[model samples]
Target: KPWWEDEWEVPRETLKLVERLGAGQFGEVWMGYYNGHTKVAVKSLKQGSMSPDAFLAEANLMKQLQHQRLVRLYAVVTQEPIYIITEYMENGSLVDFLKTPSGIKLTINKLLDMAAQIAEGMAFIEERNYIHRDLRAANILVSDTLSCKIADFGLARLIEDNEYTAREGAKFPIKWTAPEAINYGTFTIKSDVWSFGILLTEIVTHGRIPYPGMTNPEVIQNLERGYRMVRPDNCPEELYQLMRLCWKERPEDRPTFDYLRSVLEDFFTAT
Candidate 1:
């Protein structure tokens, strides 16, 4: 069925809300069940934050774009207090998962595997001409089996004619953004590459905040001076080199997701 069709819409009454998983500026996420059995995630958009058409558009785009490392959207409810349903992630956000005691002990190989999945998912998005404007560790979801998948497309947009222009003063996750994106209000696949590098730092450090202890203004100042985070403890020198490649001063200098994926695959295979 077309994403907008009523057939794809689930009645709000059909879902049994189990728990509030999390909340963000745009909405609150809850663990819910459909028809009393199927576990799913329900994201309830804040009132007046999104128009019906825009919600449908995002849903349609998500429905069409599918990768093993990308979360699946099951259905959307267009009624007031809109709901977007997707497959439940038993392990929750990657950031939270990494904070647990067991998470701190994850093997380097497992961390590399998760990073590879993220890169592959992002490569798929870039190949489809889309930019996940909010790529970060917090936006990644981990399954009970330890599989990782990229989630959260509220800020995602198509690369019309190759780039997206953000209005001045638009809020962004400063620590994860590239210089061009933060200074010039421009976003492209390369900008996403920069965020991926920050994500790599998060993964290797077991979810440590990027540029730890630096304020937003300080982070901008540091980037202007060509400063980057030091290699995380226990990270392989070769992998650290890839992170540096992603944070190149110029967008064109950053490696493409395809190249990043290949490097990661080779690293994992050779180890």
Candidate 2:
């Protein structure tokens, strides 16, 4: 395992797993504490499911990435089942938060605030040549005060010449992915930008499932025909326009995250 730029090794005995938060393809996450008093979220890789080098690569990438709108990785436990400790998100994932009763009442301003935070985080990753292949509402964390931070870098990868080629038949989140990515396995910052559009739609709709009632195959077919979801109820026209820009058939036609952030900021200022 390559040495992480940050030495964040924590003794296995020091972490107290409190409750199961959730699980993903690779592992489970829990609400936990470090050394008794410091609250944290512990993400553990499934036993025998991943090689140490793979896990270490993820750790090293995360350790090197730091931004206000990105979740903080605090420590790692490398023995037996591996564990990664990160700052606890009081509000949990944005998708779940939007489903809560309190979240249903959030104002458009608040939703835009969360979206802008995510955009800023994504812009940071883009500037650093990293691609968050799994950008979605579920991957975004929320604080008690509604601050949003992008998290879950398991599917993230560094790209060369602005693109990465995936192995044949690799699965992706069909509804949230750009057509180019869905059809050719070509991933880039622009594809992430496309997913961000879907994510913005998710935000405005209070977490309604994208392409509701459509199967994966159906979504693929529809997107290939240049179809997309209509604007969510009560979504601003300007915001909807931005989403449309992201869904443009050609990746090069889509706006950059920097442009997205600037437009979102203008929207906030106008309101």
Candidate 3:
């Protein structure tokens, strides 16, 4: 066996599932305890939730792609349905956390920290030549200290590699999606930046769903007419202008995460 494989392997019995963090007909992601002490997370596949072989491939991709800004992959269970053990964030998804009383208590500077962490994570992913098509707040998790990290980043690329490419009408979130990605299945790091803009709105609005009461059909129609979001109260014009730049008509016109990260970091030092 390869040296990396031995270090990455985990015996299933050592992991005890504590509670389901999130689930659906798709699959299960839950909190778990390792050897009765270490807090970790488990992502498991369900039978009818698409092809497991492909997911296994992407999960293996997780083994090599570890960074501090991305959730740490502790180990894996190789029995029947493969299980991945990842870092546990007590605060859960950034989307749900922002809806809480304490999450709403945060200041804009703190929100910028959240956004900055996300940009740093994506910058690394882009450096590795990956495009996280589903770059929403929910896919980003928050820790007890409110630090944000990206989770399941490669599944977006995995889905794109499927036989049923998005050109076949694979469902994507209209409001969170960029114009070309929705119409022509163009998913690039720039498109990821576009979704990052929507995620920022969630942070700024304290978890208000994008487009408020508008349906997906209307969201697409409005986008076709060149509409973007209005700035939320107290979000400051600086960040809003940056967010607007992410929504530029063409992907090439969007700012790279490297620039976004630098600007966010600038908030702490520059006037």
Candidate 4:
């Protein structure tokens, strides 16, 4: 028998892969129905590409993070080809939601509503001393009611030092990365703030991909040259200002997630 066809395999029958939800560089995610009442999003990693220990690390990290706005790890099957089951997001990713024609006109108020939830989730992760490392609209899944949950902790790590530099295979998402991430490779809670700013821009832009016309190298160049994603036309001036502040050159200059969350809470209350 082939190596992957091991006896300890978790039965695919237990999780009928109804449909593919999304694909990532390393694996594919599917929507599965489990025992009738439980629906899950299953992320199956390409066997042999990622070590079993890697999958376990991911599960361990996700299991430790419990928050309403964070995706929960439901189960893990690592007998052979590793499969991780997570809470299914019925409404799909924020990325897919925004690309639709109707997604374009999403109001600033609605964007803020979603952004606030993302911040809440991020703050939770940050307080636990974990860095999301990968924060993007696609990683932020939405519920049917439009609530946001931060998903995809593939690159997240518990912070050891006050700062970290990206290693090979951990490159920042060009559009979402802050200036410091690109130039100095420094990442901290503040670096995450930079990415959060980009996420805010994506939400307001109705899921627009940042720097549509630029390549990764060009994006780095542009960012180094002081170019940043422009706020959408409908974005509130204060929100635009927040984004600008988040994209500040120095990571230390960025506001804490708690501070940003407070501002958003007040903004929503005043509106």
Predicted model with the maximum TM-score: 2
Number of the candidate with higher TM-score, 1 or 3: 1
- Model 3, 1-271: lDDT tens digits are 4424667777888999999978977679889899999999988878767676765666677765688998888877666577878899999999999989999898887888888999999898777777778899889989998899998754556334321235655668888988777877777888888999888888888888887778888887777798877677677788889899899988889999989898887873443
Number of clashes recorded per candidate: 0, 0, 0, 0
Query: Would you estimate the TM-scores of all the predictions?
Result: 0.92, 0.93, 0.90, 0.87
Angstrom error at residue 93, model 3? 0.3
Number of the candidate with higher TM-score, 3 or 4: 3
The digit string of per-residue lDDT tens for model 2 on 130-164 reads: 99899999999999888999998977888878789
**Ranking of predictions according to lDDT:** 2, 1, 3, 4
Off by over 4 Å in 2: 1-6, 23-26
TM-score sort, best first = 2, 1, 3, 4
Cα lDDT for residue 66, candidate 4: 85
As for lDDT, the candidate ahead, 1 or 2, is 2
Query: What residue pairs clash in candidate 3, if any at all?
Result: none
RMSD of each: 2.1, 1.9, 3.0, 4.3
Writing each residue's lDDT as its tens digit, candidate 1 over 92-142 gives 889989988878889888888888889999999999999998999999999
Go through the candidates in order and give each one's C-alpha lDDT. 0.87, 0.87, 0.81, 0.80
Q: What lDDT score is found at residue 191 in candidate 3?
A: 86
Score candidate 1 by TM-score against the native.
0.92
- What residue pairs clash in candidate 4, if any at all? none
Strongest candidate by lDDT: 2
Judged by TM-score relative to the true structure, which candidate is superior, 1 or 2? Answer: 2
Name the runs in model 3 displaced over 4 angstroms. 1-6, 158-165, 268-271
Q: Give the CA lDDT, 0 to 100, for residue 98 in model 3.
A: 93
